[PDB]
Design a protein around this ligand. Structure first.
Ligand code: SF4
Lengths: 74, 396, 60, 449
């Protein structure tokens, strides 16, 4: 499944989007998944939108975030 | 009988007009001809299939409404073999006959060699995953097997009903038809479900619905019930109804039309809410196209003209007891059923409400005219209301 | 009479409660009339209840 | 065959059905005492299970993080499906003008009320904070909070409440004439005035039967879409979700057919001993069992059609999750329930096609038992197996039920049978005025030959 994505740096330099173009070709035959929804959702234009990004190239599994979450959130 | 001949002449005139303008649209554009012929074949198939199913259902559960229209159901179901020959053009579309007859690209996506073959220019892995099942040879074999089953069941039941008018109606020719209908119901459900999967659902190989097909059976049942109510109002004075038919069968058929209308609305809403609340992207493109470029107005009209208005009118004890009023409602229902099928099939081709061509209106009328003409010939072949029948006492 | 009141009452209750009084956004589902799916069941059940109660109590 | 065999009289029906109740307490048959003792013992098992569940919590079950819904939902769907057949017999057959509903509508509807009463505890028991169940009901509060109404559990609350109330008032409307016949034969003065206020002083007369028949016709015409929508909503609770094995579009009719399937199996299993014990062989004939097994076979075939549609859907789509769902059902760690499903509700229902098997009583009892086991296995396959293995492989685990949810199951059986034994002891189990009307109709039909 498409849980974990891995690439090479030599191919990443020429195109940083090459990993995403793969998989979608083997799953759909095209380079872009034209996902369509039936729900409108909300706008979030002029307001704050909190988000988080996890870099897999930096995670080492030290399990420090788990103990911090346990100590912070009771 | 004279009213049946007038109906036969009207059906012949509607059929020849529809075929003529359909041929004109073919000469103008060969692709749009087959696109409309698919929808016309899908909408015209509802009368014979629904007639066969209701014939076998009323044989399993005998009632007054079943004996009232038994011969009419047999006449409508006896037109199935001619419908199988009418499938030949569609089969020619998805076979190698394309590149001829004016078809640039094959009629179905799963029949295009550029799609189902790996390494092709238009390779789609989801469509190609079904390459042995969705094949022109396999589809034609499944369609032919379903037609052999349907024709064998209909012709055998009609032949046994004709023999019932000779002798031995109590001991045999009433239990044999009941057991044949018992096994036929399961056979008819499986065959029609896969027929609906092959002809209509395979137009978009990216989408599938399990409830689909059963929606087609309820749709065909509502169409053939309104058709039976119309033809009953036409032949209400054939000297056979006058002496053996009262208001009870008309009231029961009106109640059946009401029950099948709310059943169809229940199936359609069930499919809608299941796909709507669970916003999975593999099932959303279907309801996206049907709510885009004006197609939403078609859905809203079906919600009101095909549900609320029939539900409230047929709610009363009147309008179902009176044959005249029931026939008027049945005509509105029949018109709405045509629009519902257009909402399911036409968006795949036209993709716009304005893009609907004249052939999309020609093919349904052109093929239903042949269906009505064959139905009128089959009902004039034999007398109505089998007098030699142990269930005839239910009419007293 | 009571059945139509029951159906109308159920639709009004849902629309006022979740699309007017407290407009909670749940799963991006619409807050307009476009939330007409998922309002049919409560409306249908309310109408059947009032109609059935009227028939039994009315006969008595 | 005929649905009413001998030359019964109106007084024959009245005395034979009225003699089962009104029996002095010291003259109660010993078989009723043994059955009520077993049902009361299982009821004490129910009380111990619920008490411990309230004291400790829903953690005594085997539910975990991936499988958050265990047998606490399986037994709920099983019980709520048991009553669909009785609601069909007591309402749908009234509109269909079928004459074989006159002798079994009372017992069947009683089974519906008791099955709904048993199924109405799981939405409260499985809550984990049960005493806050009223928060799902739109009530005036000091906060200003509403239920979502966009979830299927809010529909479920409105559906069960409407189903239970309408089935209760319809049952009482049908019991009113029988209450009048009981207070007319009650002999004792204090047994009277009890059925008297229950009959509301019926005084069976014209200008009253007309409104009674029309209200009963309207009630049946209203309760038919009610029970259909109820089980369709119990199907929507899984179909609304995104779980691969749960988002199946054919779930509403598949659940309705499965409910009436298991219901007819339970009704046959419980009516055959009732028929053979009391002198009711003249009212519940063999043609009753024949047509009931035919309806059960038809609903089982619709269920098999649902099995095929699920298999076709898993094979038709190129989704990894539908394919793994089929693989986890066929060769997974819980494939035993799928194999038991295929054996019970698909192979064992085939002998019902023939006539000799359809007229055999022990074969009907065995088939009904196998069908009930297969229905429980089907609810297990739909819920637990689909919930065990989801999209993220790391969130995979196994569900192993404990002893307490089993104790709740046997306990619910005991409460169900306790209520049934009390019903057959106090009230008449066969609708009397409908049976004598059926006798009058058969006499008129024989007059017209
Ligand atoms: S704290 Fe450790 S385990 Fe958590 S994200 Fe950072 S590197 Fe990974």
């Amino acid at each position: 499944r498409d849980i974990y994505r891995v690439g090479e740096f030599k191919k990443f330099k020429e195109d940083p989007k090459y990993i995403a173009k793969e998989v979608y070709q083997e799953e759909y035959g095209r380079e872009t998944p034209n996902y369509q929804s039936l729900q409108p959702g909300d706008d979030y234009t002029g307001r704050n939108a909190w988000g988080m990004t996890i870099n897999l190239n930096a995670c080492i599994g030290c399990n420090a975030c788990v103990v911090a979450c346990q100590a912070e959130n009771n | 009988i004279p009213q049946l001949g007038q109906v036969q002449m009207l059906g012949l005139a509607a059929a020849v007009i529809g075929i003529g303008v359909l041929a004109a649209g073919y000469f103008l554009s060969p692709t749009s001809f087959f696109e409309s012929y698919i929808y016309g074949y899908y909408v015209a198939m509802t009368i014979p299939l629904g007639c066969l199913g209701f014939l076998m259902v009323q044989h399993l559960t005998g009632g007054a409404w079943g004996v009232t229209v038994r011969r009419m159901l047999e006449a409508g179901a006896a037109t199935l073999p001619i419908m199988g020959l009418l499938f030949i053009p569609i089969a020619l579309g998805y076979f190698d006959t394309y590149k001829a007859l004016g078809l640039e690209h094959p009629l179905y996506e799963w029949a295009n060699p550029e799609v189902v073959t790996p390494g092709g220019a238009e390779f789609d892995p989801i469509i190609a995953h079904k390459v042995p099942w969705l094949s022109p040879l396999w589809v034609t074999a499944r369609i032919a097997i379903f037609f052999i089953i349907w024709s064998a069941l209909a012709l055998t039941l009609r032949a046994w009903s004709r023999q019932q008018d000779a002798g031995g109606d109590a001991k045999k020719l009433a239990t044999r038809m009941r057991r044949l209908s018992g096994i036929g119901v399961a056979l008819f459900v499986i065959t029609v479900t896969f027929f609906s999967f092959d002809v209509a659902m395979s137009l978009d190989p990216h989408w599938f619905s399990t409830i689909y097909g059963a929606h087609y059976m309820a749709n065909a049942g509502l169409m053939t019930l309104a058709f039976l109510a119309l033809m009953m109002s036409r032949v209400r004075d054939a000297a056979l109804f006058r002496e053996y038919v009262s208001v009870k069968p008309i009231h029961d058929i009106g109640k059946l039309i009401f029950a099948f209308t709310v059943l169809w609305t229940y199936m359609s809403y069930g499919q809608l809410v299941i796909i709507w609340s669970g916003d999975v992207a593999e099932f959303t493109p279907w309801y996206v196209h049907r709510t885009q470029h004006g197609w939403v107005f078609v859905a809203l009209a079906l919600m009101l003209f095909a549900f609320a208005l029939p539900f409230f009118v047929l709610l009363f004890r009147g309008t179902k007891r009176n044959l005249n009023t029931l026939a008027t409602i049945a005509g509105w229902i029949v018109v709405m059923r045509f629009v519902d099928m257009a909402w399911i099939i036409l968006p795949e081709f036209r993709e716009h409400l304005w893009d609907i061509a004249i052939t999309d209106v020609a093919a349904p009328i052109g093929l239903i005219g042949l269906v009505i003409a064959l139905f009128a010939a089959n009902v004039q072949q034999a007398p109505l209301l089998p007098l030699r029948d142990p269930n005839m006492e239910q009419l007293q | 009479l009571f059945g139509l009141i029951g159906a109308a009452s159920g639709f009004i209750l849902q629309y006022i409660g979740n699309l007017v009084d407290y407009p909670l956004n749940v799963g991006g589902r619409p807050l307009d009339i476009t939330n007409w799916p998922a309002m049919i069941p409560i409306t249908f059940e309310s109408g059947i209840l009032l109609a059935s109660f009227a028939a039994a109590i009315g006969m008595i | 065959e005929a649905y009413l065999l001998p030359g019964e009289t109106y007084t024959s029906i009245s005395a034979k059905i009225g003699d089962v109740p009104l029996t002095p307490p010291l003259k109660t048959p010993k078989g009723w005492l043994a059955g009520f003792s077993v049902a009361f013992f299982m009821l004490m098992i129910f009380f111990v299970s619920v008490t411990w569940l309230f004291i400790r919590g829903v953690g005594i079950w085997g539910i975990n993080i991936p499988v958050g819904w265990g047998m606490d939902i399986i037994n709920f769907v099983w019980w709520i499906g048991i009553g669909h057949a009785g609601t069909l017999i007591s309402a749908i057959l009234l509109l269909l003008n079928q004459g074989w509903r006159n002798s079994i509508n009372r017992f069947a509807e009683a089974m519906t009320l008791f099955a709904v009463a048993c199924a109405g505890l799981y939405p409260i028991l499985h809550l984990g904070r049960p005493w806050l169940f009223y928060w799902l009901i739109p009530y005036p509060n000091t906060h200003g909070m509403w239920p979502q109404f966009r979830s299927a559990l809010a529909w479920d609350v409105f559906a069960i409440s409407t189903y239970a109330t309408v089935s209760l008032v319809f049952w009482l409307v049908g019991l009113i004439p029988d209450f009048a016949t009981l207070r007319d034969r009650a002999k004792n003065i204090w047994v009277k005035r009890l059925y008297g206020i229950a009959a509301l002083g019926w005084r069976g007369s014209a200008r009253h039967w007309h409104r009674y028949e029309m209200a009963s016709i309207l009630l049946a015409g209203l309760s038919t879409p009610l029970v259909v929508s109820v089980h369709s909503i119990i199907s929507l609770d899984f179909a609304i979700s995104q779980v691969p094995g749960w988002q199946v579009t054919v779930f509403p009719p598949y659940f309705v057919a499965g409910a009436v399937f298991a219901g007819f199996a339970m009704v046959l299993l419980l009516m055959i001993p009732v028929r053979t014990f009391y002198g009711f062989e003249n009212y519940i004939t063999l043609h009753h069992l024949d047509v009931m097994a035919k309806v059960m076979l038809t609903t089982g075939m619709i269920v098999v059609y649902g099995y095929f549609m699920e298999v076709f859907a898993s094979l038709y789509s190129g989704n990894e999750f539908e394919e793994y769902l089929l693989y986890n059902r066929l060769f997974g760690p819980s494939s035993w329930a799928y194999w038991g499903l295929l054996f019970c509700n698909a192979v064992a229902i085939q002998p019902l096609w023939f006539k000799k098997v359809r007229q055999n009583i022990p074969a009907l009892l065995i088939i009904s038992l196998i069908v009930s086991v297969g229905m429980w296995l089907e609810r297990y396959v739909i819920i637990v197996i689909s919930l065990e293995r989801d999209f993220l492989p790391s969130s995979w685990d196994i569900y192993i039920p404990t002893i307490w949810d089993w104790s709740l199951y046997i306990g619910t059986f005991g409460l169900f049978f306790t209520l049934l034994f009390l019903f057959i002891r106090v009230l008449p189990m066969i609708n009397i005025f409908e049976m004598r009307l059926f006798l009058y109709q058969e006499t008129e039909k024989a007059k017209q030959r």
